[PDB]
Write a protein that binds this ligand. Structure first.
Ligand code: HEM
Ligand code: HEM
Lengths: 362, 361
């Protein structure tokens, strides 16, 4: 229930241990006034400093003037910080405004068309994003709601996604969670302690060509539907072939323990792990940080389940793109469909109480 | 922590309120009474396992490689998490299997209420399973696996995820707040109040339907909140809507949340004043609802609200008179009922040989 520090060379919410709940919001900008937008970013940073510490925004949730609306909507009163992190990102479309064209990073790459793509343009894209992660879903909702409220007239929410439970891990010493296909998800990720690997694979460096992005990262988001009726009638052997690990322990095929190193030649040629492994993609490595979702029924008598997939990397062109290209033949494709997509440049961290979100860009 | 599955009553009504909810309504697709009773028996066997933290059937792995596993496996390595599984039967169930003359009179169709905007597709249902637990993945796994066991005899008509408090970080005697920022639950029937449960919640044999003795009647209302409008209202308007202050949740003119209200100090159309038993001939409800937030609609607005759940001994003397009295509720400016359903919740599963619905079938 403790707080995660807000300041740092990097934004929290990436290498931070993965909290239980997600409320992810993408926003479109509705003002042409660069000065107005910069003022918003500063006001948003001030609110985030309050929210991540478990304090109400502005002058609080009650006790102000009776005839004025409260500054904070109040549904997080009496709750602890609950490990809330708030991570902001800038979408490619944003750089068509405020004269930012020349500052769009090369590594903020548009994604190519992938086979099987069925992307809903409504729940895709976005000028910017805010990833709210916490162990308490009310805490995460309260933060998005109050950010949106502060931004009224300058931003609007384009689409949002809640994740009811994590399917990722940055802490290999704790239990690996399972996704809705029933397999452990997150075993061979990057841990928040592996500072060497985070530098090599996640954080943008000054030499990469975009100086204002040093210390930031790049985010790929893909909403993925799961064909659970199809999956749930497949044999256990079929499910285990699809991934290359057994369902119970999550060990690589042939081995006894979850964390034993995979032996790729023992897996089928189209097994998910075999195709996704760094060694199959010239060393390309990802920080996976996704969450499970369910949004009611599908209107055809079934539950609607999926995986909201999030990956951070140092360069989209050397992370998500090569790996996802290698998944064209993935056995898993038979049970999933990508139905939403967006990319964001995640700026560096807020260094101290004088700093603000996006200050290196603006 | 686990909650015993067997008892004179079904669990999940008077038992401690868990952190999360997965509520599902099912429609029946078979006409065969025997096949349906068979399913009820299979569901009961599975619920015994699920509520103890065990996988269904012969497990989620380690069986024949050529067969699908009995359990879909996403709850492996998790704890029982106080899972309760509560089943109810909708009025439309009794048009099947020759049950028409066994529908309880207390399972009454709801009138149309002013301002209703009910989405047919998120209303009704032949039966429901209320799954409550502290871990949402435990609740979802339960619904997902019951549906799979029932595939071919029942379909999922609609489904609602909910959250209340998070127990790891919040004390138990602290009242949760709803998404309007007000404490919700202050004056409610508690599960410790055996006498009030008997008077207001549990069906008695003399009530008129013997197979429902020990059961209860459930009203579900999916209530959307107009969040963005509410958040523009002044602090005074918000407190005037309810008749309590927002910070402490004390009735107007009082000092503590649990001070008994003085109804005459509240505005004539304040929510607490219209909902109070003294304003409804003594009618009292057990509220057990959950907040929801499903995402955002096509106009950028938050799709959130209160999934209202009320248990009562007779719908005609519980939910209906109180809701009728809210016709002029000042809260009506800010909410909209968009889904509704009623269910008869049968008595408990007495022992290892009993099953869901045995008193009706
Ligand atoms: C619903 C969609 C998906 C499911 C259910 C899924 C499932 C899994 C599972 C069960 C594992 C094995 C345990 C581990 O995390 O190490 C895994 C590994 C992995 N997955 Fe996925 N995955 C999905 C989508 C994706 C996508 C879209 C990508 C990349 C574009 C990806 C990249 C990876 C990588 C890099 C690994 C680690 C392989 C290794 O280095 O050993 N996954 N995934
Ligand atoms: C979005 C919808 C609703 C909200 C936000 C809401 C909120 C509240 C709040 C804040 C209280 C005061 C604290 C408490 O004693 O629990 C309360 C009391 C109460 N509400 Fe509501 N309510 C809603 C809908 C309903 C409905 C539909 C009913 C019944 C049909 C209802 C019946 C009651 C009752 C019986 C009380 C107890 C009054 C007393 O004995 O003091 N509420 N509600």
């Amino acid at each position: 229930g403790s707080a995660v520090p807000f300041h740092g060379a990097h934004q929290a919410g990436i290498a931070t241990p993965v909290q239980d709940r997600l409320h992810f919001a993408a926003f479109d900008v509705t003002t042409e006034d660069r000065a107005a937008f910069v003022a918003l970013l500063k006001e948003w940073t001030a609110a985030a400093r309050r929210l991540t510490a478990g304090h109400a925004v502005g002058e609080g949730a009650y006790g102000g003037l009776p005839e004025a609306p409260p500054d904070d909507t109040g549904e997080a009163l009496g709750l602890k910080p609950s490990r809330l992190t708030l991570t902001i990102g800038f979408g490619p479309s944003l750089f068509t405004r405020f004269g930012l064209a020349d500052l769009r990073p090369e590594a903020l790459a548009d994604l190519p068309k992938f086979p099987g793509d069925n992307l809903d343009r409504a729940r895709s894209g976005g000028d910017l994003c805010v990833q709210a992660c916490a162990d308490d879903p009310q805490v995460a909702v309260h933060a998005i709601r109050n950010l949106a409220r502060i931004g009224f007239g300058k931003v609007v929410v384009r689409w949002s996604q809640l994740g009811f439970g994590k399917t990722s891990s940055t802490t290999p010493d704790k239990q690996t969670p399972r996704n809705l296909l029933g397999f452990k998800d997150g075993t061979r990720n990057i841990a928040g302690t592996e500072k060497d690997r985070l530098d090599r694979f996640v954080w943008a460096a000054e030499k990469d060509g975009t100086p204002w992005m040093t210390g930031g990262s790049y985010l790929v988001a893909r909403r993925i539907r799961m064909h659970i009726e199809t999956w749930d009638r497949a044999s256990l052997q079929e499910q285990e072939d699809v991934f290359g690990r057994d369902k119970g322990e999550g060990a690589p095929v042939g081995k006894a323990k979850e964390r034993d190193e995979p032996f790729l030649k023992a897996m089928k040629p189209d097994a998910h792990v075999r195709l996704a492994h760094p060694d199959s993609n010239g060393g390309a490595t990802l920080l996976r940080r996704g969450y499970s979702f369910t949004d009611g029924t599908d209107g055809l008598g079934r539950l609607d389940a999926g995986l909201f997939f999030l990956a951070y990397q140092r360069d989209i062109r050397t992370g998500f793109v090569p790996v996802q290209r290698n998944l064209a033949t993935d056995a898993l494709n038979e049970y999933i469909q990508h139905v939403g997509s967006a990319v964001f440049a995640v700026p560096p961290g807020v260094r101290d109480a004088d700093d603000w979100w996006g200050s290196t860009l603006f």
